[PDB]
Design a binder for this molecule. Structure first.
Ligand SMILES: Nc1cccc(OCc2ccccc2)c1
Ligand SMILES: Nc1cccc(OCc2ccccc2)c1
Ligand SMILES: Nc1cccc(OCc2ccccc2)c1
Ligand SMILES: Nc1cccc(OCc2ccccc2)c1
Lengths: 265, 265
């Protein structure tokens, strides 16, 4: 992978692996999400971040954390195919930061998917959210395009829709979900992609066998700790559309909420 | 990746990814195992497999793993390039063996080795059988015909008999269930998921203070998508050795047994 000519975006190619595909021999949405993280990390490294935070951030013990992830897939790449992913970041003033991605088939050059994520500042120790200070923005603004560059430009698009809270009883559920060590990242936190998998676990297998996932919007409200247990809840709201809710098994504390849109095969 | 000059082995390079590493910023043993599967599949594809021979497809037979043995000297770091060489050998009418050698691409030093024993099985009835002479003649032309062992040594760990753990186990992790990401393209639980489940019952303190040097795992029976597993471990031993057992949560049917060897950091 490499920074583009202007140094304001990063591109990387990936060959889809045998264990990365589902029953139709195409990449799962979790494989796509993992690739989005990898190209994101390679972009941060290429622009000088140490092995993820600016100078003012490390001084105040602040980190970027995902508040929302939105992914739209038109075609899932096949096992052995080469997918090219371009990524960039944009300041959203004092609110936070946005990271966007564009996925293309390397052989045809056609856009096969797009993603957008909203990040907010948080104290690493207290978990308290904060606005982006003047000093932090000045430090990372030089690595972003300064005029708008949106993966989802269209007005009233799906990435900005407000998601409601699922009401009990849920139509479908998968309970007792727990992370194993492979679900943890280098910092021993549950990987953001694991939550996508947990959301999808409550979708009936018949829907998965007869439909393709076209869109997924996921809000991240609270982290699942390594010793926590999660219940995944889903209700059809409709193409098939679903409303999702992940909550802690015991006290019912919300950790995520989301929506999925599926197209008939 | 590519076949070597003689066409009797295959090599491929992999760059270690951000989400593939643990707390020490080095590849987990499950990431290594996944890479072993990928290079294995790329080798089968390079030698003409659509992976079953003509006689195998007619008799509805497949290769299935009976045992996996991995030894790691150094886990590659995040961003490092690891080169893996793989080959197969006929083991007469008993079955087949696939071996691997892992090297640091920059230094050329051997950083790990692996060996696996495969047996023929009817895809539908799950009944094991010997390798017929017709099947052997079909794949022998893709193997070195003189011995080529990743584990040559006389009384090496790869061929040790593993006993059955007796209740009560010293440590346990109960209620483990596969999610969709744990399944392969054929909707079977991926062989690497069982390695993760075995390791779940090792206490976190051992993981934090030791590095896994050796893992031997026997595959006795499959965990179905709707099954629940219990992972059991007892210390048998500066090095720490453990005895492992995976069994179905309800009836206690054995699915795997194994051993691990850990060295102090
Ligand atoms: N941890 C990480 C690192 C780099 C980018 C990144 O993008 C946000 C995201 C990716 C996949 C799923 C959900 C959110 C996340
Ligand atoms: N923690 C983390 C992980 C992965 C990517 C990342 O992006 C930082 C960044 C790169 C380029 C421009 C602006 C910001 C931060
Ligand atoms: N499914 C598969 C495909 C190709 C090679 C392969 O090697 C055996 C193995 C690898 C990793 C863990 C346990 C066993 C397995
Ligand atoms: N089912 C399966 C999956 C992955 C590899 C594989 O190896 C087949 C093979 C390749 C080269 C020589 C002899 C045999 C079989």
């Amino acid at each position: 992978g490499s920074l583009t000519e202007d140094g304001l975006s990063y591109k990387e190619k990936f060959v889809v692996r045998s264990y990365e595909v589902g029953s139709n021999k195409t990449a799962t949405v979790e494989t796509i999400a993992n690739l989005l993280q990898e190209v994101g990390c390679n972009h941060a490294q290429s622009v000088g971040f140490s092995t993820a935070t600016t100078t003012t951030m490390r001084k105040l013990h602040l980190i970027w954390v995902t508040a929302r992830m939105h992914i739209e897939i038109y075609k899932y790449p096949a096992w052995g195919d080469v997918v090219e992913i371009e990524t960039w970041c944009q300041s959203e003033g004092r609110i936070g930061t946005r990271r966007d991605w564009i996925l293309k088939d390397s052989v045809t050059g056609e856009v096969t998917g797009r993603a957008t994520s909203k990040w907010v500042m948080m104290n690493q120790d207290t978990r308290r959210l904060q606005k982006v200070s003047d000093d932090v923005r000045d430090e990372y603004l030089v690595f972003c395009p300064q005029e708008p560059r949106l993966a989802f430009p269209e007005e009233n698009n799906r990435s900005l829709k407000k998601i409601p809270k699922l009401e009990d009883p849920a139509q479908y559920s998968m309970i007792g979900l727990k992370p194993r060590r492979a679900d943890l990242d280098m910092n021993q936190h549950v990987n953001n992609v694991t939550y996508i998998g947990w959301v999808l676990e409550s979708i009936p297998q018949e829907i998965v066998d007869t439909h393709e996932l076209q869109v997924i919007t996921l809000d991240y409200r609270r982290e699942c700790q390594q010793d926590d247990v999660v219940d995944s809840l889903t209700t059809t709201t409709s193409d098939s559309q679903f409303l999702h809710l992940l909550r802690l098994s015991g006290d019912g504390q919300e950790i995520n909420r989301g929506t999925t849109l599926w197209r008939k095969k």
